[PDB]
Design a binder for this molecule. Structure first.
Ligand SMILES: *CC(=O)NCC1CC2(CCN(C(=O)C3(Nc4ccc(Cl)cc4)CCOCC3)CC2)C1
Ligand SMILES: *CC(=O)NCC1CC2(CCN(C(=O)C3(Nc4ccc(Cl)cc4)CCOCC3)CC2)C1
Ligand SMILES: [Mg+2]
Ligand SMILES: [Mg+2]
Ligand SMILES: [Mg+2]
Ligand SMILES: [Mg+2]
Lengths: 5, 236, 236, 5
């Protein structure tokens, strides 16, 4: 999965 | 609510303890209690709220994905019929996830957003609103799916518009919003070109503004820029 | 209970799904539902029950230790008074831990133990009884502390006596019981010599019986023997 | 902490 904050 | 009798400052203190103990459900319940006191949140308090719910819903999303994979495999050709249990348990976890998202969106709507006048508070809350609509969108399959997606888009877009007007391109809130809105484009809106463009432009504009920062601010901004780069690497 | 309407086999199926999703609270609730159907548990089912509650109470114990450390630090000389919140939140987590332990002990007493006639089932349930009294003992500070410790000892001792009579020294249940009873001696009963003696004797008797085993049984036994060795290394 | 199973 891609990075989120 | 169950936290109605506990002092605001005690709820914040306990939220911090819960974080140290990695008790994120507790942390989220304490912060929900604190928000419901009706006073605006400080910077630190906004962080505690976001960390608590991010962790709770993050665990739920990971469990939902595990279950959804098992369920998708069960519906493939030659898969033995195992009954309704996989769908039922994926639905249970899904319902609990949706509940947590509704809770967070409810705090934002009653009444965090409307009282948020500063750019950092308003952008942060609108980003959260986009994030929790995005998690709803991840599990949506019905009549309202398009509207849930559009609610995520709308919240992210308002946050983007304010951030570009009021914050420097290196502001960690601006950066984190862009990172997540870019993922929304890629994973939810079926717009990978828009995701890539946003990540690249965000990264490059931030690069250009690093010269203005202290060492500590530089560290904070670059950490998030690296996440933008990581995603770009994944996508290209 | 809330699982009263769900088929036994569905509860077991969902417990397995919950394990794959690392949803251990759910797993434990499904297994509690399955035990309450009133039928004896198979080997696999006993494992699911123990794994679920071990994981739940393990998280609670880790959180309790974090909080207890903070609380002990607060009561040191020169520590600023921060109010009742650390004690209150340690008490909250403690109460929830005690509840889970009482739940497990309740399943064992009503009526898993009394229906367990085979050595593997009886030893396993008595080991669990010792384990959940041991977790109660870890947080006990009152009039009943000695009795809780003795209840742990008594359950472990009955399990030990059956295991030595009915199981080979390499049996993983026998080994795991000895490992945990040895930790009980060290950490709870203030008997480190007894802990060391039990671990060493268990290890050496198992070593001597490895020759009788298949490759797969050898792997299972040696894994637990290595834990005994690890503890011995820690203690000597 | 010591190992238990
Ligand atoms: C003043 C104000 O409103 N501050 C509230 C929050 C502190 C904040 C989040 C944490 N943070 C990070 O740099 C980071 N996570 C993150 C960044 C940006 C956003 Cl919008 C959300 C989260 C910490 C964890 O690792 C990733 C970066 C500092 C800024 C905003
Ligand atoms: C037939 C029967 O009653 N079986 C029930 C359980 C399977 C069992 C536990 C799991 N296991 C292990 O070797 C191990 N954990 C463990 C060993 C011994 C005991 Cl008493 C409890 C747990 C697996 C996880 O890593 C450590 C060893 C096989 C035997 C007993
Ligand atoms: Mg649904
Ligand atoms: Mg643009
Ligand atoms: Mg107490
Ligand atoms: Mg002896």
């Amino acid at each position: 999965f891609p990075a989120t904050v | 609510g169950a936290m109605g009798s506990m002092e605001r400052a005690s709820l914040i203190q306990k939220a911090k303890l819960a974080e140290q103990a990695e008790r994120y459900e507790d942390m989220a319940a304490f912060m929900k209690g604190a928000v419901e006191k009706g006073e605006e949140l400080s910077c630190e308090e906004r962080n505690l709220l976001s960390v608590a719910y991010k962790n709770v819903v993050g665990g739920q999303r990971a469990a939902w994905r595990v279950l959804s994979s098992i369920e998708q495999k069960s519906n493939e050709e030659g898969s033995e019929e195992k009954g309704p249990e996989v769908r039922e348990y994926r639905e249970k976890v899904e319902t609990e996830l949706q509940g947590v998202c509704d809770t967070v969106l409810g705090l934002l709507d009653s009444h965090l957003i409307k009282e948020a006048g500063d750019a950092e508070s308003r952008v942060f809350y609108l980003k959260m609103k986009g994030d929790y609509y995005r998690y709803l969108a991840e599990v949506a399959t019905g009549d309202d799916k398009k509207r849930i997606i559009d609610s995520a888009r709308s919240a992210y877009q308002e946050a983007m518009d304010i951030s570009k007007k009021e914050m420097p391109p290196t502001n960690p809130i601006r950066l984190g919003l862009a990172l997540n809105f870019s993922v929304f484009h890629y994973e939810i809106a079926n717009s990978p070109e828009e995701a890539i463009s946003l990540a690249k432009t965000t990264f490059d504009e931030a690069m250009a503004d690093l010269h203005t920062l202290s060492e500590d601010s530089y560290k904070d901004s670059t950490l998030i820029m690296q996440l933008l780069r990581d995603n770009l690497t994944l996508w290209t």
